[PDB]
């Protein structure tokens, strides 16, 4: 495996490790995830492994979306963390709604889609 291109993250001790690539199958390194992202284990860091099929995890950093405060909406989901791919229905106050007749928001690689607002 050559130097891992960790989209939305990176290796710890980058400077020390960079000169010694490529690495053999079975080698592994500690890595972190950037702001708005996390590892599949739900942490800010883990180890990335050089396997016969390349680097594992294949998607080392997943978007995490925090449900925002809704003015003119119900705030039962306020606080709550959602992982990339997860969706949630938006409950608005009477007389308010999500734009474009939308009913749910989804955590995409770039954040909430659409933006959760009533």
């Amino acid at each position: 495996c050559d130097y891992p291109d960790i989209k939305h993250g990176g290796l710890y001790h980058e400077n020390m490790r960079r000169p010694y690539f490529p690495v053999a199958v079975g080698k592994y390194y500690s890595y972190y995830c950037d702001e708005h992202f996390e590892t599949p284990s739900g942490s800010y860091w883990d180890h990335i492994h050089c396997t016969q099929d390349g680097w594992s995890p294949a998607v080392p950093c997943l978007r995490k979306c925090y449900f925002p405060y809704l003015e003119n909406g119900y705030n039962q989901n306020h606080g709550r963390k959602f992982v990339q791919g997860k969706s949630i229905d938006v409950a608005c106050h009477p007389g308010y709604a999500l734009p474009k007749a939308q009913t749910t928001v989804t955590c995409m690689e770039n954040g909430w889609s659409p933006t959760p607002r009533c």
Binding site: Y12, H13, N15, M16, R17, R18, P19, Y20, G26, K27, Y28, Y29, S30, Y32, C33, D34, E35, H36, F37, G42, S43, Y44, W45, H47, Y66, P68, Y69, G79, R80, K81
Partner: protein, 234 residues
Amino acid sequence: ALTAPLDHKDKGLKSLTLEDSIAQNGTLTLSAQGAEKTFKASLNTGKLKNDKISRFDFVQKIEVDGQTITLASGEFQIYKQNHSAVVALQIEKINNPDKTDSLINQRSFLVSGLGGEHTAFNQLPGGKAEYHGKAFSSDDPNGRLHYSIDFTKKQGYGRIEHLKTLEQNVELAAAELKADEKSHAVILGDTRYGSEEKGTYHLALFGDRAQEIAGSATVKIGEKVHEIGIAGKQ
């Protein structure tokens, strides 16, 4: 270390930057003996004891939608030398995904970074040098590091002894001494149980004449990865 400014009269290393120890562009708060200091993405190491681990309680935080949510918390471990330092994080708990204003127990140990005056690859002396110091892991702070560098041959090797959580001494196999992106001297090689490969170690040389070494190592026993903080001196 958390409150006082930097004075020349302190036994070096005097100052340490904690960039790599701050996650998700948030803040790191270190506390000990009623004192507190927050770091946003130096620690006065000059006040700390040399050739010893200094332990501070830590809390890693991020700001989301107005609310300061705790990412993680535990014990921040720093091993101090004259021209170098090694930082490890014993994570005790992490943000509860379901109740963001609270936490859950989840233990992990990470060697997050280093600090000090790095040796330039062009500052390497001739012949050989030997280094002695500490090896520390999760609930295992009394390991020993033995390391030898042949500067002419551009090679190093060593051993980690006395790690309670390992039951075999770790061989730091013969590894090449290279220059990194900043032209600083570094080594990287295999960790072993005799001849059997278990992970990787890597060291950086510190001081104007390679007086010290500092880095980290890994041992994989089954699926469990053991991270080890390592540092030595002539």
